PDB file of C-alpha atoms in Angstrom:
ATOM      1  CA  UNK A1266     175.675 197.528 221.016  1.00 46.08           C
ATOM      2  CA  UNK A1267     173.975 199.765 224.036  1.00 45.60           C
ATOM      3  CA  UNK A1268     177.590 201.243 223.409  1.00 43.50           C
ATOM      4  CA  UNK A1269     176.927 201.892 220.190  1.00 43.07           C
ATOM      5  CA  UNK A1270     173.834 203.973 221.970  1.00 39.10           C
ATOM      6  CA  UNK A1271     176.195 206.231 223.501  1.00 38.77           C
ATOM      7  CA  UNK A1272     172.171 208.325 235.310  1.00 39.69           C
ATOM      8  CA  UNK A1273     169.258 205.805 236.569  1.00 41.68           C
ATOM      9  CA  UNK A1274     168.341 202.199 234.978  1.00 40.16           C
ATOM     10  CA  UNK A1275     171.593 202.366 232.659  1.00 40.09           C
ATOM     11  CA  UNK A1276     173.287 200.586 234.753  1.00 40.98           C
ATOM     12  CA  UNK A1277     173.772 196.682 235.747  1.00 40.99           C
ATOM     13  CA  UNK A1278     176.550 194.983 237.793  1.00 43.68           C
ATOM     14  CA  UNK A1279     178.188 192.107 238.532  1.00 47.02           C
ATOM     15  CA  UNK A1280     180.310 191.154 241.710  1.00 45.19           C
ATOM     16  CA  UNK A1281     184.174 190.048 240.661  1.00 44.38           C
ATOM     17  CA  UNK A1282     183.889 186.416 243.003  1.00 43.85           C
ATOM     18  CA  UNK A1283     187.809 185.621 241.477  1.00 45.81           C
ATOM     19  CA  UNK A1284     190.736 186.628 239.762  1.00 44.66           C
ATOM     20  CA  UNK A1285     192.934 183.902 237.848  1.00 46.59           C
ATOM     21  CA  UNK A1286     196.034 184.536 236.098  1.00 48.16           C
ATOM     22  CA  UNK A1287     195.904 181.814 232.881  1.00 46.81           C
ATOM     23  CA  UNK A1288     198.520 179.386 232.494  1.00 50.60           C
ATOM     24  CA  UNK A1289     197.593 176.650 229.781  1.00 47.11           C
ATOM     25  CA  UNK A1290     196.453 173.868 231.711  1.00 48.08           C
ATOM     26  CA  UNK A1291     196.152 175.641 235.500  1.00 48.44           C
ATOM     27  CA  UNK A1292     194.941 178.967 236.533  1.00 50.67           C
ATOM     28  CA  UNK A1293     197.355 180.661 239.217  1.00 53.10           C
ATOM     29  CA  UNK A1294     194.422 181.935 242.041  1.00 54.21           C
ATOM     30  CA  UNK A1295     194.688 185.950 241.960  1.00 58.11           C
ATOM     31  CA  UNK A1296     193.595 188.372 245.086  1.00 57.88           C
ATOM     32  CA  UNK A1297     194.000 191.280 243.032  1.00 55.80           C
ATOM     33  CA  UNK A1298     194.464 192.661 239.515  1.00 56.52           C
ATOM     34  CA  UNK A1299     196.408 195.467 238.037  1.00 58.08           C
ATOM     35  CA  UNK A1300     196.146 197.618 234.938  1.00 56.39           C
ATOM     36  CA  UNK A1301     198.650 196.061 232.139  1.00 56.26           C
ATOM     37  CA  UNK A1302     197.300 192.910 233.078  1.00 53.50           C
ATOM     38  CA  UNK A1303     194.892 190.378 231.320  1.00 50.26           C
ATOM     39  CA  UNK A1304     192.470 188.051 233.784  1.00 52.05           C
ATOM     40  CA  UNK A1305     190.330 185.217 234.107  1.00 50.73           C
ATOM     41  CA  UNK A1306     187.245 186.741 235.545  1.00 45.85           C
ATOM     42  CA  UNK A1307     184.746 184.687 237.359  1.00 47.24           C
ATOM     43  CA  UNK A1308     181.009 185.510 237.319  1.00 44.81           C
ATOM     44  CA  UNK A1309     180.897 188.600 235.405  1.00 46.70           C
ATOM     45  CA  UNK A1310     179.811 186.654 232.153  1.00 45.56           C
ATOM     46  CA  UNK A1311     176.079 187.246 232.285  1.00 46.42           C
ATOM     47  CA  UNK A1312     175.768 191.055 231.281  1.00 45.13           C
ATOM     48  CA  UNK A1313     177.440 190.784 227.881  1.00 42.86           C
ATOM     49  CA  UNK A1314     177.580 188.287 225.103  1.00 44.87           C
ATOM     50  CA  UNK A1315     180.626 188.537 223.085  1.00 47.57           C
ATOM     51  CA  UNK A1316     182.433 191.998 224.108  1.00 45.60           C
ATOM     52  CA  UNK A1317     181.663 194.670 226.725  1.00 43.54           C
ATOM     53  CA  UNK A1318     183.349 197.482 228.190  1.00 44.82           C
ATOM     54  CA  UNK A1319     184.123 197.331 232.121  1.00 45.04           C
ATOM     55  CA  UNK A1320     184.290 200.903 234.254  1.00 42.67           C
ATOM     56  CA  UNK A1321     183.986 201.929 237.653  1.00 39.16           C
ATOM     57  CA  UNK A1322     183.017 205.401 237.830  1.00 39.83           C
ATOM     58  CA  UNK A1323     182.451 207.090 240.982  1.00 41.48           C
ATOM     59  CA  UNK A1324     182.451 210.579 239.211  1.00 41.76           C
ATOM     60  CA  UNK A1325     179.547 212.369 237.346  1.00 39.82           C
ATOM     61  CA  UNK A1326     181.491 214.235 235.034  1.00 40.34           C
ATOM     62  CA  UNK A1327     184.355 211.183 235.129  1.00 40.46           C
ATOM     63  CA  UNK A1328     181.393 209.434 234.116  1.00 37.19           C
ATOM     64  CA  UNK A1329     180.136 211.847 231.105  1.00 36.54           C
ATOM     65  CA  UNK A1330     183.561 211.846 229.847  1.00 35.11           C
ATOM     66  CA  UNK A1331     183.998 208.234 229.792  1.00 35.90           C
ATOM     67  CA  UNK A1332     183.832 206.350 226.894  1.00 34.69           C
ATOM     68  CA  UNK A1333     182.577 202.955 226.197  1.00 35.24           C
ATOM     69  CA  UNK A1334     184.958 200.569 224.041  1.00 35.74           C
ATOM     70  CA  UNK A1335     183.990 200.005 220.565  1.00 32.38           C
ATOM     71  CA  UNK A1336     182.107 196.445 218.932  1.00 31.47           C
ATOM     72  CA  UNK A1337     185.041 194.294 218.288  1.00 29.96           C
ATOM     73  CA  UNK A1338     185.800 194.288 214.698  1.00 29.28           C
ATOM     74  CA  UNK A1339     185.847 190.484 213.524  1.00 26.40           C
ATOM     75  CA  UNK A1340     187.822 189.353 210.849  1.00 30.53           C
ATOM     76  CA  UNK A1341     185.186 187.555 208.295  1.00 32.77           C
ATOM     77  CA  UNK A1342     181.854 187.666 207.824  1.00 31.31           C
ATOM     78  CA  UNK A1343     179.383 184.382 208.290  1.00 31.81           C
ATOM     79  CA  UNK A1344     177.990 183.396 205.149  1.00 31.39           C
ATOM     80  CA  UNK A1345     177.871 179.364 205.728  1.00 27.96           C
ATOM     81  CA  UNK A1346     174.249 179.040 206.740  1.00 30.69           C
ATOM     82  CA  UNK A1347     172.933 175.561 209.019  1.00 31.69           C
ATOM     83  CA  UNK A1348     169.403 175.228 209.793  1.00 32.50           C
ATOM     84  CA  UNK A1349     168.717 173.677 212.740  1.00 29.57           C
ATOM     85  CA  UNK A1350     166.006 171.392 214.857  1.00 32.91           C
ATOM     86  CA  UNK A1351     166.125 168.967 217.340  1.00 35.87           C
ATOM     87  CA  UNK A1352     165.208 165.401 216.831  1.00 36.15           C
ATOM     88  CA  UNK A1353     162.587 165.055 219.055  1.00 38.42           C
ATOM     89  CA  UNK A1354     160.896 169.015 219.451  1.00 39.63           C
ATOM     90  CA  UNK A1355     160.013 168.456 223.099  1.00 39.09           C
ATOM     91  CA  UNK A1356     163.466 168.875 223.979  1.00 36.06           C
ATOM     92  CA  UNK A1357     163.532 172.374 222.477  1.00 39.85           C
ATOM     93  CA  UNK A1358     164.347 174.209 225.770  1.00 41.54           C
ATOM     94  CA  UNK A1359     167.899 172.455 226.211  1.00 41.28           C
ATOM     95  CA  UNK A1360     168.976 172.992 222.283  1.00 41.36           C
ATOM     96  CA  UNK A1361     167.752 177.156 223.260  1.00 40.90           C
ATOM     97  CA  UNK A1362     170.366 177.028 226.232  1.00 41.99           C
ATOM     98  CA  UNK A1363     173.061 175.874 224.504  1.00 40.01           C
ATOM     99  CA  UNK A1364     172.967 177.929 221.578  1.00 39.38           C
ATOM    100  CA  UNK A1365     172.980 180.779 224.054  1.00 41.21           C
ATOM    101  CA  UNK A1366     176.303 179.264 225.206  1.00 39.42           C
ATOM    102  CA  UNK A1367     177.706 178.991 221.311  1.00 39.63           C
ATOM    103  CA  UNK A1368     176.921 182.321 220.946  1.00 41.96           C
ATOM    104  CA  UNK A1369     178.898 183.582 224.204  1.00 40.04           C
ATOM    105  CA  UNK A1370     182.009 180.671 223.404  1.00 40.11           C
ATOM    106  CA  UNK A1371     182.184 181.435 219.445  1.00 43.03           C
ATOM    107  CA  UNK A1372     182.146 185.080 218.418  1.00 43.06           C
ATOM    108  CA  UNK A1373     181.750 184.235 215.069  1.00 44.34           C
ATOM    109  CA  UNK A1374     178.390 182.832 215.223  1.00 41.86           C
ATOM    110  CA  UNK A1375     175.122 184.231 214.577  1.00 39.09           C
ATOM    111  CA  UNK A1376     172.213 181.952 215.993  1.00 37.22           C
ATOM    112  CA  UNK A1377     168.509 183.133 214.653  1.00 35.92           C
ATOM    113  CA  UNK A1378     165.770 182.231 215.389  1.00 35.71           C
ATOM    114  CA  UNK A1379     162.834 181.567 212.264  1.00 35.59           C
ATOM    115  CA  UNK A1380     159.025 181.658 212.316  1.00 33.49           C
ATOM    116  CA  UNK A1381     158.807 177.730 212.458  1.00 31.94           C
ATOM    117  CA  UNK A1382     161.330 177.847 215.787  1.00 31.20           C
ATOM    118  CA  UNK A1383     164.058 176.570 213.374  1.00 30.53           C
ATOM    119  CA  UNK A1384     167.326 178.014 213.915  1.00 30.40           C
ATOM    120  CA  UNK A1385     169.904 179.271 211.816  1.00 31.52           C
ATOM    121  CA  UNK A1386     172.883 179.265 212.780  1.00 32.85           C
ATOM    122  CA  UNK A1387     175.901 181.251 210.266  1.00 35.63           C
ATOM    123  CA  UNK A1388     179.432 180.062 210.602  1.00 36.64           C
ATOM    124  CA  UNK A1389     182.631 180.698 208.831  1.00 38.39           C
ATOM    125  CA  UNK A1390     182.861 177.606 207.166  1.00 36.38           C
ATOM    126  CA  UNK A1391     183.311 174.043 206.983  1.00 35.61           C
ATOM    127  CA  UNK A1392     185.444 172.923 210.418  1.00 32.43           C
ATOM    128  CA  UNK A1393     184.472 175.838 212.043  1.00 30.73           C
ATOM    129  CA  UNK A1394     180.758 174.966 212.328  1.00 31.97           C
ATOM    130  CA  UNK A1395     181.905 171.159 212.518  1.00 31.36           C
ATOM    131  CA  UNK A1396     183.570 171.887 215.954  1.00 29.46           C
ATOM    132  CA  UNK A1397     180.796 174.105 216.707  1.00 27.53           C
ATOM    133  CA  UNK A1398     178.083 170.970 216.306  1.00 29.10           C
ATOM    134  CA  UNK A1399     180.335 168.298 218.257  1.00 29.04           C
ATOM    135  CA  UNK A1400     180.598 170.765 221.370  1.00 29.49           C
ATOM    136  CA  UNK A1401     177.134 171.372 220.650  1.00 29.33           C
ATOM    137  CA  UNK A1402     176.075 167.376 221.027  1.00 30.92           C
ATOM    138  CA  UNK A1403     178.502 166.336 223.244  1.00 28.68           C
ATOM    139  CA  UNK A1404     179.801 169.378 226.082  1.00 30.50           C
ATOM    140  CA  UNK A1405     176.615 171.185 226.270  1.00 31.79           C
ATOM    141  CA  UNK A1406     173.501 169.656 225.224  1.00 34.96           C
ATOM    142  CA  UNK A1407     173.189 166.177 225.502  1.00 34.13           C
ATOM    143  CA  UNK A1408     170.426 166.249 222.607  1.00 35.46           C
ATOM    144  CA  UNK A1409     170.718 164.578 219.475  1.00 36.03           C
ATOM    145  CA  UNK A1410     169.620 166.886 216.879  1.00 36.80           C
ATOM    146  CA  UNK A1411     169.012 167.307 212.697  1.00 36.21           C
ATOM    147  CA  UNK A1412     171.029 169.276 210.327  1.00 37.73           C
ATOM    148  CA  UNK A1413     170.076 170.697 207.302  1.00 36.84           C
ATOM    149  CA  UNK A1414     171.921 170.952 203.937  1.00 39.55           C
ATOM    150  CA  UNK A1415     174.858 173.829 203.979  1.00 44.55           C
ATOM    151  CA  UNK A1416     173.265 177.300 202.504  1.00 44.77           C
ATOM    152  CA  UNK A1417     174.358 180.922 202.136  1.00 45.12           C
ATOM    153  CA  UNK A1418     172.463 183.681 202.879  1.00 44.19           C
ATOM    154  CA  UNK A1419     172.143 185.485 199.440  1.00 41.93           C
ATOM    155  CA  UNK A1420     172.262 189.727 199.163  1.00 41.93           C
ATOM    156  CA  UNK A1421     169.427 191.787 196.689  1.00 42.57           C
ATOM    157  CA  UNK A1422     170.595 194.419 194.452  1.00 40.79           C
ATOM    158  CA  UNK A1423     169.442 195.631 191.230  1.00 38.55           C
ATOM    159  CA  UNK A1424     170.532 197.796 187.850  1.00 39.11           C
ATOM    160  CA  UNK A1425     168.547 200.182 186.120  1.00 39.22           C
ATOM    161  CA  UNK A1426     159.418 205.942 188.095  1.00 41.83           C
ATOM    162  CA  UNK A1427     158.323 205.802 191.512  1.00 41.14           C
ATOM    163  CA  UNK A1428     154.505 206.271 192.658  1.00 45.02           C
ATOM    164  CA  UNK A1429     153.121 205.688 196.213  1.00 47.93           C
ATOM    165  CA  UNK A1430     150.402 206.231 198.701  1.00 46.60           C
ATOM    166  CA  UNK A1431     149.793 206.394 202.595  1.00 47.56           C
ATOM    167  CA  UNK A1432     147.002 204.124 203.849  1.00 48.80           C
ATOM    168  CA  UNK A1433     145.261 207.073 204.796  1.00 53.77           C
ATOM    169  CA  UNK A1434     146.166 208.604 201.466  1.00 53.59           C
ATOM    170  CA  UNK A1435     147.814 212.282 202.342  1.00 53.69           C
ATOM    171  CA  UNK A1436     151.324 210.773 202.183  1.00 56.08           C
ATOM    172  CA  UNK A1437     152.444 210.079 198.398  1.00 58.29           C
ATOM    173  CA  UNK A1438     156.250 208.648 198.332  1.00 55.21           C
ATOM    174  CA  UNK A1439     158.397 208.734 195.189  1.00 55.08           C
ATOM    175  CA  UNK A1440     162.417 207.149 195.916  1.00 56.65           C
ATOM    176  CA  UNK A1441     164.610 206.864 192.879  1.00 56.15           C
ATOM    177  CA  UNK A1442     167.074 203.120 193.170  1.00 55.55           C
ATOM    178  CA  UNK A1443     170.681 203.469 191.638  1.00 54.03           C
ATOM    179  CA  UNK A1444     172.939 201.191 190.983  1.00 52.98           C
ATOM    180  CA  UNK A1445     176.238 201.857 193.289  1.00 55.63           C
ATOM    181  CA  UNK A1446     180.418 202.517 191.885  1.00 59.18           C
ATOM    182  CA  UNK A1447     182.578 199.526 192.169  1.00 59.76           C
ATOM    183  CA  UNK A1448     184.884 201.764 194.059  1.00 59.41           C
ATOM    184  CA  UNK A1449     182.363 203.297 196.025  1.00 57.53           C
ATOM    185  CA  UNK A1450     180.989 200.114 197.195  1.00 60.41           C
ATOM    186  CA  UNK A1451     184.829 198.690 197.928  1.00 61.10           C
ATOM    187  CA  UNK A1452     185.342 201.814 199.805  1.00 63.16           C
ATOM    188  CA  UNK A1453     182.441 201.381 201.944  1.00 62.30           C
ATOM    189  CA  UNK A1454     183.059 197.626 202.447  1.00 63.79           C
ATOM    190  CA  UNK A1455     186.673 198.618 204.095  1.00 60.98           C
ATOM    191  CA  UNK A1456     186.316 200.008 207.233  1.00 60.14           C
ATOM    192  CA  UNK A1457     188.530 202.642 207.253  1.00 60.95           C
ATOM    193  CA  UNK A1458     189.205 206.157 209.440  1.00 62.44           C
ATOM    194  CA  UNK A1459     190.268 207.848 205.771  1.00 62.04           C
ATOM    195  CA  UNK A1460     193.685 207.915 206.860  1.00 63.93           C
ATOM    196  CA  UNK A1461     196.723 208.924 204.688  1.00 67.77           C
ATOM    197  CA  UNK A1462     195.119 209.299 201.439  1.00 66.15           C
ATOM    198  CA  UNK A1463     192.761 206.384 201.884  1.00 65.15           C
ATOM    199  CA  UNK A1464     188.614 207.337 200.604  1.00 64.42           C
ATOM    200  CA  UNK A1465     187.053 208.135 204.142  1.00 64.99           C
ATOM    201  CA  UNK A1466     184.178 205.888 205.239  1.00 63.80           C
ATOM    202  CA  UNK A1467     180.828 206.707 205.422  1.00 64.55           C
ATOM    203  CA  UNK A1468     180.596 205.827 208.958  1.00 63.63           C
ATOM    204  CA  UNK A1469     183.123 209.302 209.523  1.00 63.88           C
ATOM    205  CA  UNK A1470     180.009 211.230 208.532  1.00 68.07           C
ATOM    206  CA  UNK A1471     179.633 212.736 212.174  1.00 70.11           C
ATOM    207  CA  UNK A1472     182.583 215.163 210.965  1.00 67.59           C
ATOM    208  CA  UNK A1473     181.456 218.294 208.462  1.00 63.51           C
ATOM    209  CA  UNK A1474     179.373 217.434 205.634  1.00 62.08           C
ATOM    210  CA  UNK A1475     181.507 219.578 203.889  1.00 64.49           C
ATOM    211  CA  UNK A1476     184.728 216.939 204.379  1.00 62.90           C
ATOM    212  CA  UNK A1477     182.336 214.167 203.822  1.00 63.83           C
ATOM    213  CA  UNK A1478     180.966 215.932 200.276  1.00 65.32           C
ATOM    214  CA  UNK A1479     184.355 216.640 199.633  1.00 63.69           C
ATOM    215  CA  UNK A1480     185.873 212.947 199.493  1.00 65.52           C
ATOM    216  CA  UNK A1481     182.931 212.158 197.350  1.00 64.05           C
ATOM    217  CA  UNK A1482     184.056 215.334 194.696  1.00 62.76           C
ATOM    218  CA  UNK A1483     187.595 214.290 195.146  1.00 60.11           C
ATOM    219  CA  UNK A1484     187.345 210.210 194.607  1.00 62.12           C
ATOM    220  CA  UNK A1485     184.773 210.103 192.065  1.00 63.84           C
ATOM    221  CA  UNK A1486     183.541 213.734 190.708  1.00 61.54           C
TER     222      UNK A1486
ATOM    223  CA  UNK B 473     130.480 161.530 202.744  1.00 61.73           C
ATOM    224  CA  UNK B 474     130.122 158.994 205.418  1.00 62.77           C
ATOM    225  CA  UNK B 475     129.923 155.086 205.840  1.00 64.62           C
ATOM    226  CA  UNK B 476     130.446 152.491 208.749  1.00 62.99           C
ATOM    227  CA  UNK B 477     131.163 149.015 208.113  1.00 61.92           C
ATOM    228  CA  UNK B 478     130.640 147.196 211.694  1.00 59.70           C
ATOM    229  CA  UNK B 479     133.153 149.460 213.793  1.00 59.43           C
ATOM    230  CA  UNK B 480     135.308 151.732 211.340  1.00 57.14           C
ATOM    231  CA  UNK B 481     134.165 154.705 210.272  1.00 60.24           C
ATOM    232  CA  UNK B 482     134.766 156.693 207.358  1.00 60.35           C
ATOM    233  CA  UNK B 483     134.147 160.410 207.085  1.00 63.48           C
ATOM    234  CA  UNK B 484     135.074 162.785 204.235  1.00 63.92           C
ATOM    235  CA  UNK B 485     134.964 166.809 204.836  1.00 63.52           C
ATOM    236  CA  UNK B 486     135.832 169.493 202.816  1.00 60.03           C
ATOM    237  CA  UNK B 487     136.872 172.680 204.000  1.00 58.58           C
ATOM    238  CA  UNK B 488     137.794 176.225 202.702  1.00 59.83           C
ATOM    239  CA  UNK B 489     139.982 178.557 205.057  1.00 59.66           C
ATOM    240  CA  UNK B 490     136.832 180.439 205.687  1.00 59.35           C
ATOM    241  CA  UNK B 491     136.056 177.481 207.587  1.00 59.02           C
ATOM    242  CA  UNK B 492     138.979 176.086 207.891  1.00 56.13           C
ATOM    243  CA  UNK B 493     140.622 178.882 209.967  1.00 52.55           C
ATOM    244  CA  UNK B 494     138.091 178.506 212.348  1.00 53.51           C
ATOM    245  CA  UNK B 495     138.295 174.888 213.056  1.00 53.37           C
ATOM    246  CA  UNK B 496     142.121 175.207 213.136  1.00 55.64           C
ATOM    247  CA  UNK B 497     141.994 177.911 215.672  1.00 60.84           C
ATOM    248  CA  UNK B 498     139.252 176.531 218.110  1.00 60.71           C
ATOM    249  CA  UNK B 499     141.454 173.885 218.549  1.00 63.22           C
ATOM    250  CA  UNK B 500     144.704 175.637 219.322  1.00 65.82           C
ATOM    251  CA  UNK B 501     143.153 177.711 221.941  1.00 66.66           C
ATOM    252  CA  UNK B 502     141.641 175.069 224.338  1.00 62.63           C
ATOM    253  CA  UNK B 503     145.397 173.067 223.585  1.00 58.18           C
ATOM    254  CA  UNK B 504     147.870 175.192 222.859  1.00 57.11           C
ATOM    255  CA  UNK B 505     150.833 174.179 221.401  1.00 57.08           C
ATOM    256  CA  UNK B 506     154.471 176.204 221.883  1.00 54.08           C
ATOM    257  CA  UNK B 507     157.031 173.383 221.161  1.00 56.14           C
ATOM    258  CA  UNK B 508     155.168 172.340 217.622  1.00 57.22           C
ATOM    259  CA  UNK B 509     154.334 168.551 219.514  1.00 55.50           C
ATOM    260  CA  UNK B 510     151.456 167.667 217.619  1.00 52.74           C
ATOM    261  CA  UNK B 511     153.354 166.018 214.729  1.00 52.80           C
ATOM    262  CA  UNK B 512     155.218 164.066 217.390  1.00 53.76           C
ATOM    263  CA  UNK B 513     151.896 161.916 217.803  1.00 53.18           C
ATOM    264  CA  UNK B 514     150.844 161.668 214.607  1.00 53.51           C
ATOM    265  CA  UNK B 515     150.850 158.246 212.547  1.00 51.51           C
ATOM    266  CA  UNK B 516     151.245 158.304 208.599  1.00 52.64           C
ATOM    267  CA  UNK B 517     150.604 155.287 206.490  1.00 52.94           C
ATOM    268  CA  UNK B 518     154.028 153.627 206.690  1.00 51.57           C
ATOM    269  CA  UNK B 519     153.712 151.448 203.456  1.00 54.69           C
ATOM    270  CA  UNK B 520     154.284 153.643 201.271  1.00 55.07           C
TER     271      UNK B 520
END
């Protein structure tokens, strides 16, 4: 996401204390690792939740031209939505660390955290956050805790003038809301390079506004 | 409104957030509370 943002303060590191080559049920101990290869790393978990992009650089313009990898694209989004507390709220502090630790052993979750110091958590569904709460109550925390009811989190929209005013009244806003195309809105929704003949996404707007205009004359006039 | 009999005492008081605020906040300043505990100490009426 700092990625997504792109010298001094940029730049945190860990040590590598040990290489492990996975095998199932062992690890095979490593001295050294290769490029093809994938590893178990040891101790290099605590800069990054979820993905991060490794690099050595020991070149300023190596450095300018390198590129950080991308936020990993994830299949589905949330939806399912758990509310949670503990059963007895002194014990806060243990259920905070270990949904820290759900967040960095299940990509898929989202754990938020509400005025009251109740916290959602957003899962893909059923099992999924089932297995979630048993590791939850039983390998991390050793806390008994409540569950709410299974939500969703819900969207706002609309279908069809404005009038506003700064607080220090020399600002006066006016915004027209439309209601968005089908297509447009499927086009946006896939996440797409606009490749072949496939509508370009928005997020390709860094190229000529021209191109970008252009796909919007071309797909829908 | 206010009556003893022998020990107990009852009192009745009626605020408005005006006043209310206040006595809330006083409160919560000289014992604050982060973890939300003072509901852990706190005893309804369990017959009903």
């Amino acid at each position: 996401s700092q990625s997504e943002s792109r010298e001094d303060d940029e730049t945190p590191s860990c040590e590598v204390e040990e290489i492990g080559l996975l095998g199932g049920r062992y690890v095979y101990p490593v001295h050294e690792a290769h490029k093809g290869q994938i590893v178990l790393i040891k101790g290099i978990s605590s800069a990054y939740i979820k993905s991060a992009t490794l690099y050595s650089v020991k070149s300023k313009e190596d450095m300018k031209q390198l590129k950080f990898f991308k936020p990993l694209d994830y299949i589905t989004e949330a939806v399912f939505k758990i509310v949670l507390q503990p059963l007895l709220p002194r014990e806060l502090p243990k259920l905070l660390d270990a949904l820290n630790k759900i967040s960095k052993y299940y990509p898929g979750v989202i754990i938020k955290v509400e005025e009251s110091g109740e916290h959602v958590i957003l899962g893909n569904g059923e099992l999924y956050m089932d297995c979630l709460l048993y590791d939850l109550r039983a390998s991390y925390a050793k806390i008994e805790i409540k569950i709410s009811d299974p939500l969703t989190v819900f969207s706002e929209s609309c279908s069809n003038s404005r009038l506003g005013e700064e607080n220090l009244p020399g600002l006066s806003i006016s915004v027209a809301a439309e209601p968005m195309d089908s297509k447009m809105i499927q086009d946006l929704s896939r996440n797409t390079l606009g490749k072949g003949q496939n509508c370009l996404d928005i997020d390709g707007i860094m190229d000529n506004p021209r191109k970008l205009s252009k796909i919007l004359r071309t797909e829908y006039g | 409104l206010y009556t003893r009999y022998l020990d107990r005492i009852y009192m009745l008081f009626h605020f408005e957030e005006d006043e209310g605020e206040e006595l809330t906040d006083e409160y919560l300043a000289e014992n604050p509370d982060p973890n939300f505990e003072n509901s852990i100490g706190y005893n309804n009426r369990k017959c009903w």
